[PDB]
C-alpha cells in the first residue's frame, strides 16, 4: 500500500502507471528527486486527480505559481498531493482509498511539468 516515486532532472518520473491493491485502505506516495537542480529551477510534486480534472488542475496550479507550490489554493480537484520539492528533498503523502471509485480514470503528475509529459496513469486493481 505504498509507492516510493522519483523525479529527476528531466522532467520524468521513474514511473508512468501506480496501480493501488483495492484491500489497501490507505495509500502512500514517497516523492523524491535524485539529481543536482534546486526546486526554484526544477521542482517536482506529485498530484492526484481525475483524468477530466487534470488539465484544469494543471493550467490554476501554474497560474498560482511557484510560492504557492503551483497548486490552486483548496482545490476541490486534487484528490491528494505532495509539497514541491527540489534535489536531495523528500515528501511524502497518504490518503484514503475509499477516495477511489471503480470505474473512474485517475492521473498523477507534477502540476509545473505535466505540459511537459510528467504524469501517469493511477489504476485500482
Ligand atoms: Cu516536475
Known amino acids: ?19 493501488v491493491d ?10 523524491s528527486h535524485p539529481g543536482n537542480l534546486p526546486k526554484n529551477v526544477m521542482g517536482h510534486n506529485w498530484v492526484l486527480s481525475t483524468a477530466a480534472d487534470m488539465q484544469g488542475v494543471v493550467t490554476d496550479g501554474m497560474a498560482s505559481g511557484l510560492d504557492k507550490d503551483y497548486l490552486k489554493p483548496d482545490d476541490s480537484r486534487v484528490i491528494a498531493h505532495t509539497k514541491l520539492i527540489g534535489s536531495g528533498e523528500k515528501d511524502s503523502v ?8 471503480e470505474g473512474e480514470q485517475y492521473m498523477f503528475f507534477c502540476s509545473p511539468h505535466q505540459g511537459a509529459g510528467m504524469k501517469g496513469t493511477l489504476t485500482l486493481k
Open 22 to 31: 483495492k484491500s489497501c485502505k490507505q495509500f502512500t506516495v514517497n516523492l
Open 94 to 101: 497518504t490518503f484514503d482509498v475509499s477516495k477511489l471509485k
Open 1 to 19: 500500500c505504498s509507492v516510493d516515486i522519483q523525479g529527476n532532472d528531466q522532467m520524468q518520473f521513474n514511473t508512468n502507471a501506480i496501480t
